[PDB]
Ligand binder design. Sequence first.
Ligand SMILES: Cc1cc([C@H](C(=O)N2C[C@H](O)C[C@H]2C(=O)N[C@@H](CC(=O)NCCCCNC(=O)C[C@@H]2N=C(c3ccc(Cl)cc3)c3c(sc(C)c3C)-n3c(C)nnc32)c2ccc(-c3scnc3C)cc2)C(C)C)on1
Lengths: 141, 104, 124, 86
Amino acid sequence: VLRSVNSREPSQVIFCNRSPRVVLPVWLNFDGEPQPYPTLPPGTGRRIHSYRGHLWLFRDAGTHDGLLVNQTELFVPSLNVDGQPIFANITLPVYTLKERCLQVVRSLVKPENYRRLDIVRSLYEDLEDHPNVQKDLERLT
Amino acid sequence: MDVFLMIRRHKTTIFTDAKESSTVFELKRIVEGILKRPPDEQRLYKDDQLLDDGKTLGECGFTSQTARPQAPATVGLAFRADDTFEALCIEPFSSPPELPDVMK
Amino acid sequence: NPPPPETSNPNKPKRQTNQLQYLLRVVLKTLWKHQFAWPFQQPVDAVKLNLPDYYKIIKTPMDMGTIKKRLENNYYWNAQECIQDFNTMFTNCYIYNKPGDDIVLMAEALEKLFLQKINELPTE
Amino acid sequence: MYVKLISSDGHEFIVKREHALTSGTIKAMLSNEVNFREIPSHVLSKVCMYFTYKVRYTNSSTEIPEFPIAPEIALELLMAANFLDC
Ligand SMILES: Cc1cc([C@H](C(=O)N2C[C@H](O)C[C@H]2C(=O)N[C@@H](CC(=O)NCCCCNC(=O)C[C@@H]2N=C(c3ccc(Cl)cc3)c3c(sc(C)c3C)-n3c(C)nnc32)c2ccc(-c3scnc3C)cc2)C(C)C)on1
Protein backbone atom coordinates (compact mmCIF):
# COMPACT_ATOMS: atom_id res chain seq x y z
CA VAL A 1 0.00 0.00 0.00
CA LEU A 2 2.69 2.45 1.10
CA ARG A 3 5.17 2.99 -1.76
CA SER A 4 6.58 5.70 -4.05
CA VAL A 5 5.03 6.08 -7.49
CA ASN A 6 7.62 5.87 -10.33
CA SER A 7 6.55 9.16 -11.92
CA ARG A 8 9.95 10.49 -13.14
CA GLU A 9 8.38 14.00 -12.79
CA PRO A 10 11.02 16.03 -10.90
CA SER A 11 10.01 17.85 -7.68
CA GLN A 12 12.38 20.05 -5.65
CA VAL A 13 11.94 19.60 -1.90
CA ILE A 14 13.37 21.43 1.14
CA PHE A 15 14.02 19.05 4.07
CA CYS A 16 14.28 21.27 7.17
CA ASN A 17 15.25 19.74 10.50
CA ARG A 18 13.54 21.89 13.20
CA SER A 19 14.01 19.21 15.90
CA PRO A 20 16.88 18.79 18.46
CA ARG A 21 17.48 15.32 16.95
CA VAL A 22 19.61 14.10 14.03
CA VAL A 23 17.13 13.24 11.24
CA LEU A 24 17.29 10.12 9.10
CA PRO A 25 15.15 10.88 5.99
CA VAL A 26 13.75 7.52 4.81
CA TRP A 27 12.55 7.15 1.24
CA LEU A 28 10.01 4.38 0.64
CA ASN A 29 10.94 2.85 -2.73
CA PHE A 30 8.60 1.50 -5.51
CA ASP A 31 8.34 -1.82 -3.57
CA GLY A 32 7.48 -0.14 -0.21
CA GLU A 33 11.00 -0.80 1.12
CA PRO A 34 12.68 1.82 3.37
CA GLN A 35 15.80 3.36 1.81
CA PRO A 36 17.44 5.76 4.28
CA TYR A 37 19.10 8.97 2.98
CA PRO A 38 22.00 11.06 4.46
CA THR A 39 21.15 12.56 7.87
CA LEU A 40 20.38 16.21 8.78
CA PRO A 41 21.98 17.66 11.93
CA PRO A 42 19.59 19.59 14.26
CA GLY A 43 18.70 23.03 12.92
CA THR A 44 19.94 22.29 9.38
CA GLY A 45 18.19 21.86 6.02
CA ARG A 46 18.93 20.62 2.48
CA ARG A 47 17.32 21.02 -0.97
CA ILE A 48 16.82 17.64 -2.67
CA HIS A 49 15.83 16.62 -6.19
CA SER A 50 12.93 14.25 -5.57
CA TYR A 51 9.88 13.26 -7.68
CA ARG A 52 6.06 13.58 -7.67
CA GLY A 53 4.43 10.77 -5.66
CA HIS A 54 7.63 9.79 -3.79
CA LEU A 55 6.88 8.95 -0.18
CA TRP A 56 9.12 9.90 2.77
CA LEU A 57 9.13 9.42 6.56
CA PHE A 58 11.56 10.93 9.09
CA ARG A 59 13.22 9.15 12.02
CA ASP A 60 15.69 9.98 14.83
CA ALA A 61 18.91 8.61 13.25
CA GLY A 62 20.18 7.21 16.58
CA THR A 63 17.03 5.72 18.18
CA HIS A 64 14.49 5.32 15.31
CA ASP A 65 11.96 7.49 17.22
CA GLY A 66 9.27 8.73 14.86
CA LEU A 67 9.34 12.38 13.87
CA LEU A 68 6.73 14.61 12.20
CA VAL A 69 6.89 16.26 8.78
CA ASN A 70 4.37 19.06 8.20
CA GLN A 71 2.64 17.96 11.45
CA THR A 72 2.02 14.40 10.11
CA GLU A 73 3.82 11.01 9.62
CA LEU A 74 4.32 10.87 5.86
CA PHE A 75 5.42 13.28 3.14
CA VAL A 76 4.56 13.12 -0.57
CA PRO A 77 5.53 16.15 -2.67
CA SER A 78 3.31 17.66 -5.36
CA LEU A 79 4.51 19.30 -8.60
CA ASN A 80 6.26 22.65 -7.94
CA VAL A 81 3.78 25.48 -8.63
CA ASP A 82 5.85 27.95 -10.74
CA GLY A 83 9.19 26.24 -9.93
CA GLN A 84 8.85 27.10 -6.18
CA PRO A 85 10.14 24.19 -4.05
CA ILE A 86 7.93 22.10 -1.71
CA PHE A 87 8.73 22.47 2.01
CA ALA A 88 9.11 19.54 4.43
CA ASN A 89 9.28 20.88 8.01
CA ILE A 90 10.52 18.13 10.32
CA THR A 91 9.72 18.53 14.05
CA LEU A 92 9.61 16.58 17.32
CA PRO A 93 6.22 15.19 18.30
CA VAL A 94 5.14 16.02 21.83
CA TYR A 95 5.90 12.54 23.12
CA THR A 96 4.05 11.28 26.21
CA LEU A 97 6.20 11.56 29.39
CA LYS A 98 6.24 7.73 29.58
CA GLU A 99 7.49 7.39 25.99
CA ARG A 100 10.10 10.11 26.64
CA CYS A 101 11.23 8.24 29.79
CA LEU A 102 11.42 4.93 27.84
CA GLN A 103 13.56 6.71 25.22
CA VAL A 104 16.00 8.01 27.86
CA VAL A 105 16.33 4.65 29.71
CA ARG A 106 16.85 2.83 26.36
CA SER A 107 19.66 5.30 25.52
CA LEU A 108 21.49 4.56 28.82
CA VAL A 109 20.81 0.81 29.36
CA LYS A 110 21.93 -2.03 27.04
CA PRO A 111 18.94 -4.25 25.99
CA GLU A 112 20.41 -7.23 27.92
CA ASN A 113 20.34 -5.23 31.19
CA TYR A 114 16.61 -4.20 31.00
CA ARG A 115 15.66 -7.21 33.19
CA ARG A 116 18.21 -6.08 35.86
CA LEU A 117 16.26 -2.82 36.57
CA ASP A 118 14.24 -2.36 39.76
CA ILE A 119 10.98 -1.56 37.87
CA VAL A 120 7.63 -3.41 37.39
CA ARG A 121 7.40 -6.42 34.98
CA SER A 122 5.23 -4.49 32.47
CA LEU A 123 7.98 -1.84 32.11
CA TYR A 124 10.39 -4.56 30.81
CA GLU A 125 8.04 -5.34 27.88
CA ASP A 126 7.77 -1.58 27.16
CA LEU A 127 11.55 -1.05 27.10
CA GLU A 128 12.03 -4.07 24.79
CA ASP A 129 9.38 -2.73 22.37
CA HIS A 130 11.83 -0.51 20.51
CA PRO A 131 10.44 2.09 18.08
CA ASN A 132 10.86 0.70 14.55
CA VAL A 133 9.92 1.62 10.93
CA GLN A 134 8.41 -1.78 9.99
CA LYS A 135 6.14 -1.80 13.10
CA ASP A 136 4.96 1.75 12.32
CA LEU A 137 4.37 1.09 8.61
CA GLU A 138 1.87 -1.69 9.34
CA ARG A 139 -0.10 0.61 11.68
CA LEU A 140 -0.12 3.54 9.21
CA THR A 141 -2.10 1.27 6.80
CA MET B 1 7.07 36.77 25.69
CA ASP B 2 5.98 34.22 28.29
CA VAL B 3 8.28 33.28 31.16
CA PHE B 4 7.62 30.08 33.11
CA LEU B 5 8.29 30.22 36.82
CA MET B 6 8.40 28.28 40.09
CA ILE B 7 7.61 30.63 42.99
CA ARG B 8 9.06 28.82 46.02
CA ARG B 9 8.83 29.33 49.80
CA HIS B 10 9.54 26.57 52.41
CA LYS B 11 7.84 23.37 50.97
CA THR B 12 5.47 25.31 48.65
CA THR B 13 6.08 25.60 44.90
CA ILE B 14 3.77 27.55 42.61
CA PHE B 15 4.06 26.79 38.90
CA THR B 16 2.95 29.92 36.98
CA ASP B 17 3.62 31.83 33.79
CA ALA B 18 3.93 35.60 33.21
CA LYS B 19 5.05 38.04 30.45
CA GLU B 20 8.59 39.52 30.30
CA SER B 21 6.85 42.94 30.25
CA SER B 22 4.83 42.09 33.42
CA THR B 23 6.11 43.62 36.70
CA VAL B 24 7.34 42.10 40.02
CA PHE B 25 4.19 43.68 41.55
CA GLU B 26 1.96 41.84 39.04
CA LEU B 27 3.68 38.58 40.17
CA LYS B 28 2.92 39.43 43.83
CA ARG B 29 -0.73 39.79 42.77
CA ILE B 30 -0.54 36.20 41.35
CA VAL B 31 0.83 35.01 44.75
CA GLU B 32 -1.92 36.89 46.67
CA GLY B 33 -4.59 35.11 44.56
CA ILE B 34 -3.22 31.70 45.56
CA LEU B 35 -1.65 32.10 49.05
CA LYS B 36 -3.92 34.95 50.33
CA ARG B 37 -1.23 37.45 51.43
CA PRO B 38 -1.12 40.98 49.88
CA PRO B 39 1.89 42.33 47.88
CA ASP B 40 3.05 44.51 50.82
CA GLU B 41 3.30 41.26 52.91
CA GLN B 42 5.62 39.60 50.29
CA ARG B 43 9.27 39.83 49.19
CA LEU B 44 10.29 38.27 45.84
CA TYR B 45 13.86 37.12 45.10
CA LYS B 46 16.09 36.03 42.20
CA ASP B 47 18.74 34.03 44.05
CA ASP B 48 19.44 36.16 47.20
CA GLN B 49 18.58 39.42 45.33
CA LEU B 50 15.42 41.28 46.36
CA LEU B 51 13.36 42.32 43.34
CA ASP B 52 11.77 45.80 43.05
CA ASP B 53 7.98 45.88 42.52
CA GLY B 54 8.11 48.33 39.59
CA LYS B 55 10.65 46.29 37.61
CA THR B 56 9.49 44.11 34.72
CA LEU B 57 10.49 40.40 34.92
CA GLY B 58 12.65 41.00 31.83
CA GLU B 59 14.58 43.75 33.68
CA CYS B 60 15.13 41.21 36.52
CA GLY B 61 16.90 38.80 34.12
CA PHE B 62 13.91 36.51 33.43
CA THR B 63 13.86 35.78 29.68
CA SER B 64 11.94 33.20 27.59
CA GLN B 65 15.27 31.47 26.79
CA THR B 66 16.01 31.14 30.55
CA ALA B 67 12.48 30.54 31.99
CA ARG B 68 11.08 27.78 29.84
CA PRO B 69 8.07 25.46 30.43
CA GLN B 70 10.38 22.38 30.77
CA ALA B 71 13.01 24.33 32.82
CA PRO B 72 11.25 27.12 34.78
CA ALA B 73 13.10 29.92 36.56
CA THR B 74 12.85 30.05 40.41
CA VAL B 75 11.50 33.10 42.20
CA GLY B 76 12.09 32.95 45.95
CA LEU B 77 9.25 34.12 48.22
CA ALA B 78 9.39 35.40 51.81
CA PHE B 79 6.24 36.38 53.77
CA ARG B 80 5.85 38.96 56.52
CA ALA B 81 6.35 37.50 60.02
CA ASP B 82 5.08 39.97 62.67
CA ASP B 83 7.34 43.13 62.90
CA THR B 84 9.80 41.77 60.31
CA PHE B 85 10.01 39.70 57.11
CA GLU B 86 10.96 36.03 57.62
CA ALA B 87 14.38 34.93 56.23
CA LEU B 88 14.06 33.53 52.67
CA CYS B 89 14.04 29.78 53.15
CA ILE B 90 13.42 27.27 50.41
CA GLU B 91 13.36 23.66 51.53
CA PRO B 92 15.19 21.52 48.96
CA PHE B 93 13.45 18.71 47.10
CA SER B 94 14.24 15.02 47.66
CA SER B 95 17.45 13.53 46.19
CA PRO B 96 17.42 10.88 43.42
CA PRO B 97 19.05 7.53 44.32
CA GLU B 98 22.65 6.65 43.37
CA LEU B 99 22.82 6.03 39.57
CA PRO B 100 22.65 2.22 39.09
CA ASP B 101 25.76 0.48 37.71
CA VAL B 102 23.64 -0.93 34.82
CA MET B 103 23.24 2.73 33.62
CA LYS B 104 26.50 4.47 34.56
CA ASN C 1 25.84 -4.42 -17.32
CA PRO C 2 28.88 -6.71 -17.58
CA PRO C 3 29.06 -10.01 -15.61
CA PRO C 4 29.62 -9.24 -11.90
CA PRO C 5 33.00 -10.02 -10.22
CA GLU C 6 33.69 -13.73 -9.60
CA THR C 7 32.82 -14.99 -6.08
CA SER C 8 34.42 -18.50 -6.47
CA ASN C 9 37.39 -19.71 -8.54
CA PRO C 10 38.64 -23.31 -9.02
CA ASN C 11 42.08 -21.82 -9.92
CA LYS C 12 42.30 -19.55 -6.86
CA PRO C 13 43.32 -21.17 -3.54
CA LYS C 14 40.47 -21.23 -0.99
CA ARG C 15 41.19 -20.48 2.72
CA GLN C 16 39.59 -19.99 6.20
CA THR C 17 41.20 -18.00 9.07
CA ASN C 18 39.84 -16.55 12.36
CA GLN C 19 40.27 -13.03 10.87
CA LEU C 20 38.29 -13.93 7.73
CA GLN C 21 35.53 -15.43 9.96
CA TYR C 22 35.46 -12.17 12.01
CA LEU C 23 35.28 -10.13 8.80
CA LEU C 24 32.17 -12.10 7.78
CA ARG C 25 30.33 -12.72 11.09
CA VAL C 26 31.15 -9.32 12.67
CA VAL C 27 32.31 -6.70 10.14
CA LEU C 28 30.28 -7.60 7.00
CA LYS C 29 27.17 -8.48 9.08
CA THR C 30 27.27 -5.08 10.87
CA LEU C 31 27.85 -3.10 7.64
CA TRP C 32 25.26 -5.11 5.70
CA LYS C 33 22.54 -4.17 8.24
CA HIS C 34 23.63 -0.50 8.32
CA GLN C 35 21.04 2.17 7.36
CA PHE C 36 23.29 3.32 4.45
CA ALA C 37 24.13 -0.17 3.11
CA TRP C 38 21.39 -0.38 0.45
CA PRO C 39 23.19 1.14 -2.67
CA PHE C 40 26.26 -1.08 -1.99
CA GLN C 41 24.71 -4.53 -1.31
CA GLN C 42 24.63 -5.42 -5.05
CA PRO C 43 26.60 -4.58 -8.23
CA VAL C 44 25.93 -1.07 -9.61
CA ASP C 45 23.03 -1.40 -12.08
CA ALA C 46 24.42 1.00 -14.70
CA VAL C 47 21.40 0.15 -16.91
CA LYS C 48 18.68 1.12 -14.40
CA LEU C 49 20.72 4.07 -13.12
CA ASN C 50 21.50 5.28 -16.71
CA LEU C 51 25.27 5.45 -16.11
CA PRO C 52 27.03 4.43 -19.38
CA ASP C 53 30.51 5.67 -18.43
CA TYR C 54 30.27 3.88 -15.01
CA TYR C 55 31.76 0.54 -16.11
CA LYS C 56 33.99 2.40 -18.63
CA ILE C 57 35.59 4.51 -15.81
CA ILE C 58 35.31 1.85 -13.03
CA LYS C 59 37.48 -1.04 -14.23
CA THR C 60 37.35 -3.01 -10.92
CA PRO C 61 33.73 -2.78 -9.70
CA MET C 62 33.08 -4.07 -6.19
CA ASP C 63 30.04 -4.40 -3.95
CA MET C 64 29.15 -5.91 -0.53
CA GLY C 65 27.20 -8.77 -2.17
CA THR C 66 30.37 -9.92 -3.97
CA ILE C 67 32.45 -9.57 -0.78
CA LYS C 68 29.83 -11.50 1.24
CA LYS C 69 29.65 -14.29 -1.34
CA ARG C 70 33.49 -14.38 -1.48
CA LEU C 71 33.80 -14.56 2.37
CA GLU C 72 31.14 -17.31 2.38
CA ASN C 73 32.91 -19.27 -0.38
CA ASN C 74 36.34 -19.03 1.33
CA TYR C 75 37.57 -17.08 -1.76
CA TYR C 76 40.11 -14.88 0.04
CA TRP C 77 43.55 -16.10 1.04
CA ASN C 78 43.79 -13.70 4.00
CA ALA C 79 42.08 -10.68 5.67
CA GLN C 80 44.08 -8.08 3.69
CA GLU C 81 42.77 -9.52 0.38
CA CYS C 82 39.20 -9.01 1.69
CA ILE C 83 39.92 -5.50 3.12
CA GLN C 84 41.34 -4.49 -0.30
CA ASP C 85 37.93 -5.39 -1.81
CA PHE C 86 36.07 -3.15 0.65
CA ASN C 87 38.54 -0.32 -0.07
CA THR C 88 38.02 -0.76 -3.86
CA MET C 89 34.23 -0.57 -3.36
CA PHE C 90 34.60 2.74 -1.46
CA THR C 91 37.36 4.14 -3.76
CA ASN C 92 35.13 3.42 -6.80
CA CYS C 93 32.42 5.58 -5.23
CA TYR C 94 34.84 8.44 -4.43
CA ILE C 95 36.26 8.33 -8.02
CA TYR C 96 32.98 8.24 -9.96
CA ASN C 97 30.87 10.64 -7.88
CA LYS C 98 31.61 14.32 -7.11
CA PRO C 99 32.20 15.44 -3.46
CA GLY C 100 29.07 15.93 -1.34
CA ASP C 101 26.78 13.79 -3.48
CA ASP C 102 24.49 11.90 -1.13
CA ILE C 103 26.09 8.59 -2.13
CA VAL C 104 29.59 9.85 -1.16
CA LEU C 105 28.38 10.80 2.36
CA MET C 106 26.86 7.30 2.81
CA ALA C 107 30.12 5.65 1.72
CA GLU C 108 32.04 7.91 4.17
CA ALA C 109 29.78 6.79 7.06
CA LEU C 110 30.15 3.10 6.16
CA GLU C 111 33.94 3.51 5.80
CA LYS C 112 34.25 5.30 9.17
CA LEU C 113 32.32 2.39 10.77
CA PHE C 114 34.36 -0.17 8.81
CA LEU C 115 37.70 1.25 10.04
CA GLN C 116 36.46 1.24 13.68
CA LYS C 117 35.44 -2.45 13.46
CA ILE C 118 38.65 -3.39 11.64
CA ASN C 119 40.66 -1.61 14.38
CA GLU C 120 39.57 -4.45 16.72
CA LEU C 121 40.52 -7.33 14.35
CA PRO C 122 41.89 -10.26 16.37
CA THR C 123 45.41 -11.30 15.28
CA GLU C 124 46.11 -14.31 13.03
CA MET D 1 -8.11 27.57 38.99
CA TYR D 2 -5.41 25.56 40.78
CA VAL D 3 -4.84 22.06 42.32
CA LYS D 4 -2.41 21.16 45.07
CA LEU D 5 -0.32 18.02 44.43
CA ILE D 6 1.53 16.91 47.58
CA SER D 7 4.63 14.67 47.22
CA SER D 8 5.48 11.77 49.56
CA ASP D 9 7.94 14.01 51.46
CA GLY D 10 5.46 16.84 52.09
CA HIS D 11 6.30 19.34 49.33
CA GLU D 12 3.19 21.08 47.93
CA PHE D 13 2.97 21.81 44.23
CA ILE D 14 0.27 24.23 43.08
CA VAL D 15 -0.45 23.93 39.37
CA LYS D 16 -3.37 24.92 37.08
CA ARG D 17 -6.14 22.26 37.20
CA GLU D 18 -6.09 22.26 33.37
CA HIS D 19 -2.38 21.27 33.48
CA ALA D 20 -2.84 18.54 36.11
CA LEU D 21 -5.66 17.07 33.90
CA THR D 22 -2.77 16.07 31.52
CA SER D 23 -2.55 13.02 33.82
CA GLY D 24 -5.30 10.50 33.02
CA THR D 25 -5.01 9.29 36.64
CA ILE D 26 -5.51 12.78 38.13
CA LYS D 27 -8.36 13.40 35.65
CA ALA D 28 -10.10 10.19 36.84
CA MET D 29 -9.45 10.98 40.54
CA LEU D 30 -11.09 14.41 40.13
CA SER D 31 -14.02 12.94 38.09
CA ASN D 32 -8.81 20.63 45.25
CA GLU D 33 -5.91 18.51 46.62
CA VAL D 34 -4.13 15.23 45.67
CA ASN D 35 -1.54 13.43 47.89
CA PHE D 36 1.01 11.04 46.41
CA ARG D 37 2.56 8.85 49.14
CA GLU D 38 4.82 7.06 46.64
CA ILE D 39 6.02 10.01 44.46
CA PRO D 40 8.90 12.12 45.95
CA SER D 41 9.30 15.90 45.35
CA HIS D 42 12.30 15.67 42.94
CA VAL D 43 10.06 13.49 40.71
CA LEU D 44 6.73 15.34 41.21
CA SER D 45 8.33 18.75 40.40
CA LYS D 46 9.53 17.25 37.10
CA VAL D 47 6.07 15.77 36.32
CA CYS D 48 4.57 19.28 36.91
CA MET D 49 7.16 20.72 34.46
CA TYR D 50 6.02 18.13 31.89
CA PHE D 51 2.38 19.23 32.40
CA THR D 52 3.31 22.84 31.52
CA TYR D 53 5.34 21.66 28.49
CA LYS D 54 2.53 19.37 27.22
CA VAL D 55 -0.12 22.14 27.51
CA ARG D 56 2.13 24.79 25.94
CA TYR D 57 3.46 22.78 23.02
CA THR D 58 0.38 20.60 22.20
CA ASN D 59 -1.07 21.86 18.83
CA SER D 60 0.19 25.37 19.75
CA SER D 61 2.94 26.07 17.16
CA THR D 62 5.87 24.58 15.23
CA GLU D 63 9.33 23.97 16.81
CA ILE D 64 8.78 21.70 19.83
CA PRO D 65 11.82 21.57 22.17
CA GLU D 66 13.05 18.36 23.87
CA PHE D 67 11.74 17.51 27.35
CA PRO D 68 15.08 16.96 29.22
CA ILE D 69 15.47 14.05 31.69
CA ALA D 70 18.63 13.48 33.81
CA PRO D 71 19.83 9.82 34.05
CA GLU D 72 19.43 9.90 37.85
CA ILE D 73 15.65 10.59 37.75
CA ALA D 74 14.77 8.58 34.56
CA LEU D 75 13.64 5.25 36.18
CA GLU D 76 11.56 6.88 38.93
CA LEU D 77 10.11 9.36 36.41
CA LEU D 78 9.21 6.43 34.07
CA MET D 79 7.39 4.69 36.95
CA ALA D 80 5.49 7.88 37.79
CA ALA D 81 4.50 8.60 34.14
CA ASN D 82 3.27 4.98 33.88
CA PHE D 83 1.08 5.37 37.01
CA LEU D 84 -0.15 8.91 36.19
CA ASP D 85 -0.95 7.90 32.56
CA CYS D 86 0.57 10.97 30.89
C1 LIG E 1 13.61 8.69 -12.15
C2 LIG E 1 13.85 8.35 -10.71
C3 LIG E 1 15.05 8.48 -9.97
C4 LIG E 1 14.77 8.02 -8.74
C5 LIG E 1 15.56 7.90 -7.47
C6 LIG E 1 15.98 9.31 -7.04
O1 LIG E 1 16.63 10.03 -7.77
N1 LIG E 1 15.60 9.73 -5.81
C7 LIG E 1 14.77 8.98 -4.85
C8 LIG E 1 14.22 10.09 -3.98
O2 LIG E 1 13.08 10.65 -4.62
C9 LIG E 1 15.36 11.10 -3.93
C10 LIG E 1 16.00 11.05 -5.33
C11 LIG E 1 17.52 11.23 -5.28
O3 LIG E 1 18.26 10.31 -4.90
N2 LIG E 1 18.02 12.41 -5.68
C12 LIG E 1 19.44 12.72 -5.45
C13 LIG E 1 20.31 12.11 -6.56
C14 LIG E 1 21.80 12.15 -6.27
O4 LIG E 1 22.28 12.91 -5.44
N3 LIG E 1 22.56 11.29 -6.96
C15 LIG E 1 24.02 11.36 -7.06
C16 LIG E 1 24.46 12.10 -8.31
C17 LIG E 1 25.44 11.31 -9.17
C18 LIG E 1 24.76 10.47 -10.23
N4 LIG E 1 25.39 9.16 -10.35
C19 LIG E 1 24.94 8.06 -9.74
O5 LIG E 1 23.76 7.72 -9.82
C20 LIG E 1 25.95 7.30 -8.88
C21 LIG E 1 25.35 6.10 -8.15
N5 LIG E 1 24.33 6.64 -7.24
C22 LIG E 1 23.68 5.95 -6.36
C23 LIG E 1 23.05 6.71 -5.25
C24 LIG E 1 22.97 8.10 -5.33
C25 LIG E 1 22.39 8.84 -4.31
C26 LIG E 1 21.90 8.19 -3.20
CL1 LIG E 1 21.17 9.12 -1.91
C27 LIG E 1 21.98 6.82 -3.08
C28 LIG E 1 22.56 6.08 -4.11
C29 LIG E 1 23.56 4.49 -6.42
C30 LIG E 1 24.72 3.69 -6.58
S1 LIG E 1 24.33 2.03 -6.82
C31 LIG E 1 22.68 2.33 -6.41
C32 LIG E 1 21.82 1.14 -6.12
C33 LIG E 1 22.38 3.67 -6.43
C34 LIG E 1 20.98 4.20 -6.43
N6 LIG E 1 26.02 4.14 -6.69
C35 LIG E 1 27.24 3.68 -6.19
C36 LIG E 1 27.33 2.48 -5.33
N7 LIG E 1 28.22 4.44 -6.58
N8 LIG E 1 27.67 5.47 -7.36
C37 LIG E 1 26.38 5.28 -7.42
C38 LIG E 1 19.76 14.20 -5.28
C39 LIG E 1 20.04 14.70 -4.01
C40 LIG E 1 20.38 16.02 -3.82
C41 LIG E 1 20.48 16.89 -4.90
C42 LIG E 1 20.85 18.31 -4.69
S2 LIG E 1 19.99 19.61 -5.43
C43 LIG E 1 21.10 20.70 -4.72
N9 LIG E 1 21.95 20.19 -3.89
C44 LIG E 1 21.87 18.81 -3.91
C45 LIG E 1 22.86 18.02 -3.10
C46 LIG E 1 20.22 16.39 -6.18
C47 LIG E 1 19.88 15.06 -6.36
C48 LIG E 1 16.75 6.94 -7.58
C49 LIG E 1 17.83 7.19 -6.53
C50 LIG E 1 16.26 5.51 -7.47
O6 LIG E 1 13.47 7.63 -8.70
N10 LIG E 1 12.90 7.86 -9.98
